Amino acid sequence: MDVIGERIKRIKEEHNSTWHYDDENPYKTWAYHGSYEVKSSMINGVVKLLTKPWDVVPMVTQMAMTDTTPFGQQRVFKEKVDTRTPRPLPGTRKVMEITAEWLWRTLGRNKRPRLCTREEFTKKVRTNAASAKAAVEDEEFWKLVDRERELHKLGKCGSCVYNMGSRAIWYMWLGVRYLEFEALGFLNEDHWFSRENSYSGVEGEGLHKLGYILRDISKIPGGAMYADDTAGWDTRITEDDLHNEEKIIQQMDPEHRQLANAIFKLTYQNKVVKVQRPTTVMDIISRKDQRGSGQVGTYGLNTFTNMEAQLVRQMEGEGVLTKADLENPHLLEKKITQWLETKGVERLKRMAISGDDCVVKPIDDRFANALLALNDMGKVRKDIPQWQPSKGWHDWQQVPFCSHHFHELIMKDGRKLVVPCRPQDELIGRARISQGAGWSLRETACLGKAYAQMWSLMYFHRRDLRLASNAICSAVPVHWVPTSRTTWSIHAHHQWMTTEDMLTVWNRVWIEENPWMEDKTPVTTWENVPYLGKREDQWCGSLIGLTSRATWAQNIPTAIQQVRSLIGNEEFLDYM
Ligand SMILES: O=C(N[C@@H](Cc1ccc(O)cc1)C(=O)O)c1cc(-c2ccccc2)c(=O)n2c1sc1ccc(OC3CCCCC3)cc12
Numbered sequence: 001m002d003v004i005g006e007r008i009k010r011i012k013e014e015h016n017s018t019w020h021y022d023d024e025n026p027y028k029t030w031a032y033h034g035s036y037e038v039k040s041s042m043i044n045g046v047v048k049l050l051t052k053p054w055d056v057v058p059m060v061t062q063m064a065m066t067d068t069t070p071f072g073q074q075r076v077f078k079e080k081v082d083t084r085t086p087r088p089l090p091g092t093r094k095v096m097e098i099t100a101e102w103l104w105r106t107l108g109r110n111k112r113p114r115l116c117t118r119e120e121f122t123k124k125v126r127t128n129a130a131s132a133k134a135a136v137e138d139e140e141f142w143k144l145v146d147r148e149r150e151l152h153k154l155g156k157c158g159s160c161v162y163n164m165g166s167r168a169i170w171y172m173w174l175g176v177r178y179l180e181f182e183a184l185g186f187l188n189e190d191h192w193f194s195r196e197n198s199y200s201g202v203e204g205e206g207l208h209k210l211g212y213i214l215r216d217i218s219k220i221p222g223g224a225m226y227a228d229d230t231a232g233w234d235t236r237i238t239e240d241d242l243h244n245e246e247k248i249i250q251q252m253d254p255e256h257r258q259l260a261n262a263i264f265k266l267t268y269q270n271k272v273v274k275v276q277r278p279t280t281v282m283d284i285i286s287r288k289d290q291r292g293s294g295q296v297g298t299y300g301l302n303t304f305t306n307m308e309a310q311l312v313r314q315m316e317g318e319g320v321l322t323k324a325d326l327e328n329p330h331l332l333e334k335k336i337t338q339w340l341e342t343k344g345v346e347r348l349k350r351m352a353i354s355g356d357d358c359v360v361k362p363i364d365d366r367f368a369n370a371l372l373a374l375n376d377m378g379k380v381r382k383d384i385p386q387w388q389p390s391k392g393w394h395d396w397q398q399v400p401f402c403s404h405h406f407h408e409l410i411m412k413d414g415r416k417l418v419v420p421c422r423p424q425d426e427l428i429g430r431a432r433i434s435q436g437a438g439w440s441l442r443e444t445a446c447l448g449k450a451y452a453q454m455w456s457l458m459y460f461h462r463r464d465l466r467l468a469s470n471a472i473c474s475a476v477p478v479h480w481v482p483t484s485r486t487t488w489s490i491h492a493h494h495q496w497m498t499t500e501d502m503l504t505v506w507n508r509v510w511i512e513e514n515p516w517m518e519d520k521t522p523v524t525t526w527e528n529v530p531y532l533g534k535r536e537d538q539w540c541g542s543l544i545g546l547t548s549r550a551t552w553a554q555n556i557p558t559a560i561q562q563v564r565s566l567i568g569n570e571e572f573l574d575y576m
């Protein structure tokens with residue numbers, strides 16, 4: 001309470017109207033403080049019309065239901081988030097500590113930690129929105145930020161709360177996120193987890209490059225390629241991991257260390273969380289041993305903790321760590337350090353890690369059964385008995401990573417592409433969703449265009465998607481700019497948010513600026529841009545071959561014209 005008490009007192013005093021201690025609260029692993037009272041999805045008509053066959057598809061239908069109400073916020077909360085991860089064994093705790101140290105040193109070999117700024121935060125906020133904008137322009141916002149910073153320098157914290165008249169707390173939230181960005185932003189802003197700096201990371205590489213990266217790993221001699229899912233990663237982050245993560249502060253300057261120390265000790269290793277629940281109230285809870293997913297640095301810190309954990313699993317697999325070692329309070333460091341120094345970077349290059357998502361090609365398949373450390377650390381795998389060996393892949397094109405798998409294509413001119421793919425229903429289902437309500441047909445059309453153009457660059461190889469994309473582009477006016485973002489994914493670089501010729505953009509991404517494309521001959525026509533094989537298009541969810549799809553394909557200009565006539569008397573272009 002000596003840390004969180006000051007934040008507890010302010011929310012108490014602010015909402016003392018309806019403040020109380022409800023003894024029928026469902027919080028067993030979280031510490032509960034109090035509560036107070038406070039106040040399906042919409043469909044993209046343009047995309048829907050132009051994808052009629054997928055009206056009668058379960059996965060598309062399922063994606064047309066969002067559970068953003070407080071009913072759903074508690075539904076999945078207690079299952080994973082209200083649980084305790086047992087403390088790792090002394091040996092495991094030492095190994096992690098050594099590895100973390102070694103890893104932090106390796107990452108900061110060239111780069112240097114530094115504070116991010118008001119100007120950077122401002123620049124990002126503006127470009128993103130293209131309400132927080134209003135707060136950034138407000139000078140009194142930044143004055144409040146300074147106030148809290150002085151508290152943070154003093155080791156205290158007053159207003160930094162986390163969420164799972166209104167502008168007051170809205171400023172407090174945004175201000176709290178800036179202070180994080182200030183202290184820990186550099187990890188993201190200076191690209192510490194770029195593949196060049198991290199070896200295993202893929203920050204700033206982009207979806208289009210991920211397939212090429214995995215193919216490169218497959219060339220590395222060793223065992224199979226393992227991509228194990230962790231059950232609720234952010235919930236499995238221990239107190240120990242947080243102690244390992246903060247070791248980064250050792251490379252910071254005094255004034256920067258100072259601020260980062262506060263962020264770690266006061267908002268990560270302790271956290272006062274707001275969570276909404278029907279009875280409609282807001283419960284105030286706190287704990288020390290999990291990740292605040294909405295916070296800044298999360299991706300960076302997950303990537304780090306995962307990199308470490310996999311190196312440790314690799315060590316176990318290689319027979320460096322035994323059961324006895326993990327149990328040992330007085331485990332010797334020599335063999336670990338030796339391993340890290342001689343083989344560490346090599347073993348990092350065998351991995352592609354983005355947050356809790358990982359792919360690993362160990363030197364052999366002992367890794368598959370090396371599960372002592374992995375389970376002991378807390379990173380228990382999803383939907384598989386704790387001690388059952390992992391299922392690896394012998395073809396990199398089967399390996400799942402960042403919600404995708406990847407295909408190697410052969411173009412008509414002999415050159416080879418490597419493209420991202422996933423079930424066609426997931427892509428179409430997502431496209432048919434529009435965000436929120438009160439959207440005009442123009443705004444609805446431009447989102448459809450955004451999605452249509454994303455498919456042109458990333459999923460062009462899917463026959464149905466290319467057809468649907470050309471249909472949407474035909475039905476939507478030419479000079480209308482794609483507005484709202486198609487995804488929040490960190491791997492999306494948003495090359496489709498443009499009114500430039502998509503074949504020109506395609507050429508830029510896949511030929512021109514593609515390090516793996518040696519011959520830079522321009523592809524002059526979409527006829528030269530390849531698809532997957534028919535059978536693999538079908539295996540990944542295509543409806544090519546079905547009558548209904550042939551009907552849809554045959555009757556598509558009629559539907560385009562209907563959308564055109566409802567949009568109005570504008571300038572359209574045909575892409576059929
Ligand atoms: O406030 C948020 N939601 C808004 C805004 C937003 C902004 C940025 C972002 O991406 C995602 C969402 C929305 O959904 O539109 C939000 C949500 C989430 C979130 C996502 C999945 C699960 C739980 C939380 C979220 O992750 N975030 C927000 S605002 C926000 C700001 C920065 C941020 O940094 C990332 C990248 C750099 C390293 C640290 C992590 C993350 C972040």
Ligand SMILES: [Zn+2]
Nearest residue numbers: 157158159160
């Ligand atoms: Zn604070």
Ligand SMILES: [Zn+2]
Nearest residue numbers: 407421422540
């Ligand atoms: Zn596929």
